[PDB]
Amino acid sequence: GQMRLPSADVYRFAEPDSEENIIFEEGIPIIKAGTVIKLIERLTYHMYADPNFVRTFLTTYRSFCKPQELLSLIIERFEIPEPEPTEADRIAIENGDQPLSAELKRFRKEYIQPVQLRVLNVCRHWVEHHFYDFERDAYLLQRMEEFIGTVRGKAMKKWVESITKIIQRKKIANITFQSSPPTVEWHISRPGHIETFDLLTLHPIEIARQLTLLESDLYRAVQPSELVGSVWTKEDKEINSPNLLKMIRHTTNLTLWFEKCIVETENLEERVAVVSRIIEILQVFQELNNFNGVLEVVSAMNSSPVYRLDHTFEQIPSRQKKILEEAHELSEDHYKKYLAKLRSINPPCVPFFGIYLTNILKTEEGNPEVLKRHGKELINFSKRRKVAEITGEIQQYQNQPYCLRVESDIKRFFENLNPMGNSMEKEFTDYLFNKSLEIEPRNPKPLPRFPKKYSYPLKSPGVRPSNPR
Amino acid sequence: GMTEYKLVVVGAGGVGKSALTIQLIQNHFVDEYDPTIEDSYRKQVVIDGETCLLDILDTAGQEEYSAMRDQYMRTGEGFLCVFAINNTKSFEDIHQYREQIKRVKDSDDVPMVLVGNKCDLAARTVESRQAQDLARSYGIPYIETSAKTRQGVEDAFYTLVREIRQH
Amino acid sequence: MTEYKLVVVGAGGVGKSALTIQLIQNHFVDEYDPTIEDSYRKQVVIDGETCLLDILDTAGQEEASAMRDQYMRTGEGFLCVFAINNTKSFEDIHQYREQIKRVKDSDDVPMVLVGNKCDLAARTVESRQAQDLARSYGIPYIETSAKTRQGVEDAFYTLVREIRQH
Ligand SMILES: Nc1nc2c(ncn2[C@@H]2O[C@H](COP(=O)(O)OP(=O)(O)NP(=O)(O)O)[C@@H](O)[C@H]2O)c(=O)[nH]1
Numbered sequence: 132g133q134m135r136l137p138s139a140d141v142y143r144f145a146e147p148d149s150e151e152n153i154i155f156e157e158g159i160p161i162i163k164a165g166t167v168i169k170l171i172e173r174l175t176y177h178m179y180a181d182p183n184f185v186r187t188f189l190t191t192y193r194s195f196c197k198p199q200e201l202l203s204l205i206i207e208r209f210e211i212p213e214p215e216p217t218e219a220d221r222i223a224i225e226n227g228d229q230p231l232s233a234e235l236k237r238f239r240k241e242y243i244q245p246v247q248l249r250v251l252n253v254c255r256h257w258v259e260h261h262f263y264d265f266e267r268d269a270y271l272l273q274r275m276e277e278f279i280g281t282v283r284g285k286a287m288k289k290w291v292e293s294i295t296k297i298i299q300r301k302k303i304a305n306i307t308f309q310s311s312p313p314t315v316e317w318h319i320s321r322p323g324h325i326e327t328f329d330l331l332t333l334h335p336i337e338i339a340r341q342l343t344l345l346e347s348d349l350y351r352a353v354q355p356s357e358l359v360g361s362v363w364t365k366e367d368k369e370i371n372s373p374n375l376l377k378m379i380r381h382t383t384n385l386t387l388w389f390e391k392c393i394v395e396t397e398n399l400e401e402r403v404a405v406v407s408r409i410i411e412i413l414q415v416f417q418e419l420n421n422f423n424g425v426l427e428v429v430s431a432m433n434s435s436p437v438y439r440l441d442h443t444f445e446q447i448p449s450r451q452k453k454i455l456e457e458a459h460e461l462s463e464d465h466y467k468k469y470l471a472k473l474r475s476i477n478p479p480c481v482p483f484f485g486i487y488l489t490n491i492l493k494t495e496e497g498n499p500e501v502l503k504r505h506g507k508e509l510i511n512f513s514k515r516r517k518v519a520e521i522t523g524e525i526q527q528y529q530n531q532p533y534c535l536r537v538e539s540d541i542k543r544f545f546e547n548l549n550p551m552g553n554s555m556e557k558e559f560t561d562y563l564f565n566k567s568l569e570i571e572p573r574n575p576k577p578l579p580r581f582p583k584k585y586s587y588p589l590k591s592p593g594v595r596p597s598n599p600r
Numbered sequence: 601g602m603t604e605y606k607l608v609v610v611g612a613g614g615v616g617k618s619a620l621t622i623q624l625i626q627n628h629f630v631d632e633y634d635p636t637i638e639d640s641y642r643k644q645v646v647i648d649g650e651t652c653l654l655d656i657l658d659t660a661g662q663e664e665y666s667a668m669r670d671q672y673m674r675t676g677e678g679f680l681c682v683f684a685i686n687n688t689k690s691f692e693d694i695h696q697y698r699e700q701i702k703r704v705k706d707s708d709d710v711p712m713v714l715v716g717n718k719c720d721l722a723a724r725t726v727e728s729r730q731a732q733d734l735a736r737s738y739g740i741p742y743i744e745t746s747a748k749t750r751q752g753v754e755d756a757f758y759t760l761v762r763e764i765r766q767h
Numbered sequence: 768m769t770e771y772k773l774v775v776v777g778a779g780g781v782g783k784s785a786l787t788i789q790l791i792q793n794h795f796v797d798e799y800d801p802t803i804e805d806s807y808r809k810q811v812v813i814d815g816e817t818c819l820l821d822i823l824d825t826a827g828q829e830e831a832s833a834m835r836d837q838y839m840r841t842g843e844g845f846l847c848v849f850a851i852n853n854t855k856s857f858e859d860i861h862q863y864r865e866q867i868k869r870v871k872d873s874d875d876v877p878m879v880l881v882g883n884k885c886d887l888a889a890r891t892v893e894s895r896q897a898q899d900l901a902r903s904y905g906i907p908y909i910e911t912s913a914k915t916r917q918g919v920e921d922a923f924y925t926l927v928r929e930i931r932q933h
């Protein structure tokens with residue numbers, strides 16, 4: 132037979148499943164909706180582990196349960212009453228013999244120990260991967276430390292002592308590769324001469340490599356806490372989503388810098404060299420699977436000031452037109468080809484974050500927080516699972532590091548890039564458009580000529596890497 | 601076969617803009633959505649007896665990628681410019697959105713509609729007369745919509761398609 | 768993109784977690800934090816085909832020994848890990864092998880035998896003894912170091928190939 136359970140009166144997590152407290156989707160079950168009690172029961176279920184569910188729950192639960200209340204509920208889950216001796220045990224004890232205690236031993240081995248271990252696994256994952264709850268609420272941390280530090284008995288002892296140490300390390304808080312990174316490449320600007328660094332004087336290969344390291348680090352720093360609840364769109368976005376916003380602002384600044392480099396090069400021949408160089412940087416971005424970088428370039432080329440420069444585009448070599456066209460086609464039909472390419476490449480990569488943001492926002496806006504069934508309100512967990520599928524995809528691409536060497540001066544150059552200066556956005560983008568009109572006026576105005584501005588060679592070194600001994 | 605219209609939703613973030621397209625494309629009668637689903641943004645409709653296909657681009661959530669607006673807008677034939685009736689700043693943003701659309705499309709006469717969206721029960725701060733006056737100054741229709749009851753949603757999109765057809 | 772469910776099993780402390788985190792993050796974990804159950808995902812191109820690895824990292828401590836059927840039911844292939852400086856962990860391999868066969872009711876489950884910590888000089892299990900066992904199971908034997916990365920990709924990706932050809 133199945134094990135008997137404690138009375139639901141003394142232990143709330145023994146109430147029978149019903150459609151008034153849990154609904155499953157149509158080989159472990161998938162939960163569509165349930166009460167918070169039923170969600171926590173299945174989070175720590177005695178029959179099976181569900182590590183995906185643990186991640187999903189810990190990522191999304193704050194939309195239906197406060198952190199303090201979650202801790203109270205899992206402590207309640209942990210404190211399971213043991214059954215009384217059975218009739219056979221009673222008769223043994225009455226004769227002065229030791230009881231077999233078969234039902235008690237089975238309940239310990241097959242209910243209490245698995246549930247308690249799975250409660251501890253929730254605590255371990257909570258502290259390791261969602262520690263911001265404790266950073267933002269010191270009393271919550273004290274309660275967790277007290278609970279873990281007072282678990283008695285030898286079956287849990289190894290994990291209790293480990294979790295205590297993990298918490299202490301998290302309070303006060305290295306990569307190895309299959310091969311060596313390639314040699315850093317230099318062009319007109321030489322090492323240490325940061326004052327000459329510019330779009331055409333740095334090596335286009337190394338521009339793409341150093342921007343990829345920067346953009347990968349920015350991508351890898353975004354935590355799910357900055358995304359759940361759509362908090363990057365709300366009034367406190369600067370407080371709640373600072374790494375995401377830093378990442379987006381880098382992308383915006385690089386796109387605007389590309390546009391500024393183009394339209395401030397008034398000589399046609401020089402401007403063709405500038406646009407060609409940016410397309411070469413895009414080629415290396417593609418080779419590195421830096422899709423954020425790819426779209427940084429594509430966005431600049433599609434901008435109002437740049438897209439209209441027909442005299443410039445006319446002189447771009449055919450092979451480079453084809454590179455730009457292939458990159459542009461990634462975004463067509465709601466990013467159809469981008470999504471397929473992302474799912475086919477071999478990481479490391481840098482995804483474009485914007486699609487994830489739109490899908491999280493629309494999932495949260497387009498599904499209800501609760502489902503009403505038989506007069507009860509059940510938490511709509513399917514909605515949270517969908518959000519956590521997206522945050523899980525984000526995290527999967529955050530794991531793999533690039534085997535590229537940092538160049539500290541080139542890194543600082545791109546970190547400090549500020550194309551807008553002290554100008555506001557409208558003032559600056561109007562300036563860019565008026566520059567575009569100056570250098571290639573609307574028909575039928577004649578095309579003027581402009582003097583050269585660059586005193587160094589415009590010929591590109593190309594984007595195939597070199598390798599001395 | 602049937603005409604396809606490429607429509608683009610633009611407007612301030614954080615004030616319920618996404619409910620407009622979600623409510624349109626939704627299973628009207630089941631409050632549910634998976635935006636990752638291939639063609640969660642395509643809908644076949646009949647407008648004035650003529651069947652057509654709507655392809656709607658709504659990049660809600662990407663508002664901070666401000667240098668991508670030109671790229672996204674370039675894809676569209678008609679535009680829904682959306683503000684929230686309880687957020688005056690989103691209403692004041694409309695002028696610059698319209699100017700940016702005109703620049704990207706290189707036209708002074710781009711099919712577009714002004715949409716005032718009621719995204720919650722917080723007090724209205726933009727009166728309908730203010731928005732009607734703005735729309736009239738631009739020569740475009742004004743439609744008000746509810747983010748919760750689906751009221752006005754069909755009118756907003758169908759009115760824009762009529763602006764395209766009569767361009 | 769095909770999805771593969773890999774499970775890493777073996778005695779406590781042999782390096783199951785260090786192996787998995789080295790594969791996932793290219794980072795060696797010095798701490799010994801006993802696992803209850805962890806899961807990881809990795810998109811990777813193997814023999815020209817992109818796939819998605821789901822990796823279940825399991826508990827080796829004996830206190831968790833009654834909770835294994837549930838993860839063995841779901842797994843499609845198993846890394847059976849011992850440490851080459853721990854003879855008891857090698858003797859524990861056959862218990863994992865037999866339990867997997869029982870749960871999955873199959874003599875033909877994709878598996879790879881992994882001898883970890885091969886960066887350490889002080890070996891107590893000889894390669895030949897482990898290779899003999901692997902041959903008796905019909906599976907390959909791969910020595911690994913979660914610390915240096917030696918053999919790590921080979922172990923996991925060999926298991927993928929055996930699931931693919933199953
Ligand atoms: N030198 C060396 N140490 C290793 C190697 N793999 C793991 N270790 C060390 O061995 C200890 C245990 O590693 P760990 O990955 O936690 O082992 P586990 O099999 O996951 N333990 P459990 O079953 O309790 O979860 C750690 O101190 C770790 O640094 C290896 O290849 N070389």
Ligand SMILES: Clc1cccc(Nc2nc(NCc3ccco3)c3ccccc3n2)c1
Nearest residue numbers: 406432433437438439440443444455456459
């Ligand atoms: Cl200076 C400069 C640099 C790059 C592009 C342009 N101008 C441009 N580009 C076109 N296709 C390339 C592409 C793909 C994504 C963005 O642009 C194009 C196609 C048809 C009609 C007109 C066009 N005008 C100008």
Ligand SMILES: [Mg+2]
Nearest residue numbers: 783784801802
């Ligand atoms: Mg472990």
Ligand code: NA
Nearest residue numbers: 686687688725
């Ligand atoms: Na307001």
